[PDB]
Design a protein around this ligand. Structure first.
Ligand code: GPR
Ligand code: GPR
Lengths: 210, 209
């Protein structure tokens, strides 16, 4: 059986970037799907350390927290920069991706109809930093840090794909980010994974707003 | 000082990294930013995400408080003994970061209206950390393994600011109560917690706590 198991709701949500990573790296994992019905029963929730999913198992190591799982796969699969400085910059990127992710989630779950217009107007300023980091790394021709893919590329890639669904063309003002998403999306194992039913057939978020 | 910390004259998101630097006997310079300078706009526009803290380690410039904790954890050896412990140190820190956002949100947007409900809900938010301790040698050492990690300093900060918000909130948690007492007593840390640069700084920017 594969050493990896992902336990989560049948949505892309906080597991889309970790699944893209495993698929692009050629690793197998098993999905254990939890329906909203099983979750309301209550017993699996009370068993989760912070009362939430995802849950991930690597052999007998059980982890919670989506970013902990990305960093763990980052360090075991050698996707964490080539030295100490790169690793610090990969973290700095992931943390800026997590802050925009939090704001995204908050909109979808609490203010979609009344805040979409204001969130969209303010998007370009939130996206500029990643355009700027790409500008300074080999003129935006490789990955977000150094010249080897890292876990933060998969998380940043997912964050841009969902915003392009929320605000179509929102990357039009950003040439390096635009080429970056097309370059990454065409990696053979990732392209195949992104066109497969296992990915396309799951909603982005749990309430079906996107 | 290979180190420079740039931030407002408040504890906030720099309390845990200063605790770490002080406890590990490291030297650093504070570059204090007042709300008058901040509002002028120069520095902020040069800030990658438009926010502080900003930290310099020789010619390395970093932003993001958890990035800075991680960097100091990796470089000073406070990231667990191996890959499995590093993953658990991360899991703890992320849990601290989740509760710190809720805390931060109580302070900046719903203090007078949302404080009673927040305090009523707190015991449920502190249980996970009581549980993690109980699983590591019965909660007698640190949050993960037998060595201190960068997540211990962040959890310590988070527990100390809640004792301020809701006095006696750890009375129901023996392992967490003990843990604050034992960590607060490390010599270089105890000195720092009693110094004016720590004691005379407000916790938050709006002066609410
Ligand atoms: N810090 C954690 C956050 C984890 C998290 O937010 N988990 C959500 C689902 S992700 C996400 C979501 C976010 C906010 C609110 C609801 C959900 C949700 C609910 C059902 C199905 C899918 C989702 C996802 O959209 C959850 O477990 N909720 C169930 C519960 O807490 O009782 C991580 O990064 O791993
Ligand atoms: N993910 C980032 C968050 C950084 C952050 O929130 N920085 C705040 C100050 S911390 C914190 C704070 C949190 C929320 C709201 C205000 C503040 C604040 C304002 C002034 C002085 C001090 C603070 C702190 O309380 C900031 O720079 N805000 C000013 C600005 O953007 O213009 C990190 O972890 O480093």
């Amino acid at each position: 059986m594969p050493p990896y198991t992902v336990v989560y709701f049948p949505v892309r949500g906080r597991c889309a970037a970790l699944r893209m990573l495993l698929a692009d790296q050629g690793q197998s994992w098993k999905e254990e799907v939890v329906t909203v019905e099983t979750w309301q029963e209550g017993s699996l929730k009370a068993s989760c350390l912070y009362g939430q999913l995802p849950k991930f198992q690597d052999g007998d190591l059980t982890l919670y927290q989506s970013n902990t799982i990305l960093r763990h796969l980052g360090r075991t699969l050698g996707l964490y920069g080539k030295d100490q400085q790169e690793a610090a910059l990969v973290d700095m990127v992931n943390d800026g991706v997590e802050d925009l992710r939090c704001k995204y989630v908050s909109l979808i779950y609490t203010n979609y109809e009344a805040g979409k217009d204001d969130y969209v107007k303010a998007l370009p300023g939130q996206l500029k930093p990643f355009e700027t980091l790409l500008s300074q790394n080999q003129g935006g021709k490789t990955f977000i840090v150094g010249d080897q893919i890292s876990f933060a590329d998969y998380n940043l890639l997912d964050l841009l794909l969902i915003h392009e669904v929320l605000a179509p063309g929102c990357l039009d003002a950003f040439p390096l980010l635009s080429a970056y998403v097309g370059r990454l999306s065409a990696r053979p194992k990732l392209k195949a994974f992104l066109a497969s039913p296992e990915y396309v057939n799951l909603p982005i978020n749990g309430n079906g707003k996107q």
